[PDB]
């Protein structure tokens, strides 16, 4: 149950000294990452998020306007070009504000949800690096919501429901929620902080989430909600974050025309559900010990023949399953059938399809799961539709 | 017919001085970019490429091993981390060799086709930057093929077929091809170069492609084939490149176990069809003058009502088209039908559905193209079928 060992065994990823804390995604690992992209994207459509893409580096002058340069300059990678300093972005927030600043915005346009699979880079200490979970380069399921003060409580409601929607997909039901209150050094009045913390507190009340305060741990520009999930080994993982911000939109001159025809600064909500997806894949690898759900598996079906008298029956069925959008491979090697099954059981392939002349004539397939249960011979069309339903529903459990 | 002018009008992207030569992709522009990813990935499956993902930056020590540091140090962004220097990758070639080096490779594993949507950054002179077409940060439809010397002809043939397959999708048929022979300073013997240039020359001759010798224009590590497509304005655009490399795999300790059990250094083919994806989108924007094909359009269908008595019929119809994988949005505003239709014609929306009392009862839609042609009132399921076929087939033309 160590993702670094399982990652090398299943040929998912590797890392090396020439790029500390940066991931070489192999084909199978990149398949798992891309499937997470689709799953998150399906949520963005349902929750009505835009998806954007910001550049990897911006002028250091811009990063000074945000106030983050004075705080986290050592964690930033800096480069030079024609006597100008550029910073590789460790966050997507200033970039999203820049998209927001293009073209006059009105209250008609709010709330405006803006998501990005933004690649961020942080100059993390090398001694702290560990596998997929403490890295220098990571992709964040990041989003930013621009809205009015009145729309804060409803927008946070969507973020809260989004958090439990996505976690329950992976089987994470034990979630601990903490709210961070105002720190010693902060901006804004006490009154503004009172309603900001109330909006987070109320939004958790309307969802029946019991939570717990983390006193003084909030950022200097707003309180936040942090979600912590517990794996099958009862290890806490802090993944979700909903962060209010009353500083950055004003620092970057973001504005909209309100109902009263006066110019107003919008409120920014920073939200991430999975946090670092490279880290999240590490959690999934150890939570499932490599036995990924069928929708996440790099190879979903392997079809084998007993002899060569079925090699192109396998070939036709491999094509037939491929046209169904199933990641399927064929194993026509001159090896014992037991040797082939142990080969792909070791690789954690969800389903093994075995074809003898018993099933070739009847147009059926013997089906075996990686766990070992033999489901007998069933119609190919019935097998394909069952496989589709499992993949489309992202079912945690296989057949029976 | 200016990609920059069309980009701002259709809200595709924007650029600013805070990140010169770098593109902020908006929601509509990022839809076009992601659709090209799907199209390219469709070709990768057909031609059996692996898709991997390399790190965004790597140690400058490795870049000195490749020999690229001596020649292209001025074009590389560099950063520091714990008294070590790292270069943001201007190319994906060393990263793919690192992935290939993990695990001993046999001759049975070749040809190894490895593709990546690599994000490369180059310190281009800011005075030369131009919109989407000369940029500092770009994404490349990149790939590298590892094979033996006997496999070069067959692999180059596949690259040539893929070049014309993808260009024909976008309506580019006039393509000019040039072969760059040996330069004054080069590695390897004459016989190696004689064989290498012959393989490129023979492959171009077999495919009956007229080609012009670019005498002395090849790289020092191998000859190359460059493809230039001509747009509807008869302007030349150099996009495709096929480079043979006999230096880097030996420099980076790449090897495989041959059928004679003697370890050999493989041959690398550097391959890109579209070149920079930002640049290709710019060419496509000017080629169509914003009238994107239905499969690339950010919004494919707009459904409108006549009065408020059909707002519900549009809403279910929009959802019904949405479930069919069609990018559809509803326009239920309180504006005249002529005002609505112009609003979405200016936005180059391919199709516009109109619902009065006549079609709500009959379960039909009045369908109009952005060219201005009325197609009458047809069945809802029939227009959904025809829309999917046009999207699935990537049709340049519309209905009729
Ligand atoms: O937590 C978040 N922001 C915080 C405030 O806003 C601030 O970004 C904290 C921080 C930034 C950069 C570094 N660093 O090491 O460069 C460390 C800490 C945050 C969480 C999820 C999504 C987002 O877009 C978010 O912005
Ligand atoms: O053309 C290619 N390689 C050539 C050899 O291999 C070499 O890459 C030329 C080069 C130009 C400019 C810079 N630069 O830093 O501005 C670096 C290298 C090439 C073409 C398609 C795909 C790829 O991955 C390819 O590599
Ligand atoms: Zn943020
Ligand atoms: Zn290359």
Numbering used by the authors:
A (entry chain A), B (entry chain B): 242 to 641
The authors write:
Here, we report that a critical glycine residue (Gly463) dominates the motion of threonyl-tRNA synthetase (ThrRS) and the sensitivity of the enzyme to antibiotics. The natural product Obafluorin (OB) is a potent inhibitor of bacterial threonyl-tRNA synthetase (ThrRS). Our previous work showed that OB covalently binds to ThrRS, forming an ester bond with a tyrosine residue in the catalytic center via the highly strained β-lactone ring, making OB the first covalent aaRS inhibitor with demonstrated crystal structures. The binding of OB induces a large conformational change in ThrRS.
In particular, Gly463 is adjacent to Tyr462, which is the residue covalently bound to OB, and Leu489 is located within 7 Å of the OB in the pocket. The results showed that 36j and OB increased the Tm of EcThrRS_L489M by 22.7 °C and 22.6 °C, respectively, suggesting that OB strongly binds to EcThrRS_L489M, similar to 36j. OB had a strong inhibitory effect on EcThrRS_L489M, with an IC50 value of 215 nM. Therefore, the mutation of Leu489 to a methionine does not confer resistance of EcThrRS to OB. An EcThrRS_L489M–OB complex structure was successfully obtained by cocrystallizing 300 μM EcThrRS_L489M protein with 600 μM OB. Because in the OB-binding conformation, the active pocket has a larger opening, we refer to this state as the “open state”. In short, the β-lactone ring of OB opens and forms an ester bond with Tyr462; the o-diphenol group forms coordination bonds with the ThrRS conserved Zn2+ ion; and the nitrobenzene group binds between Tyr313 and Arg363.
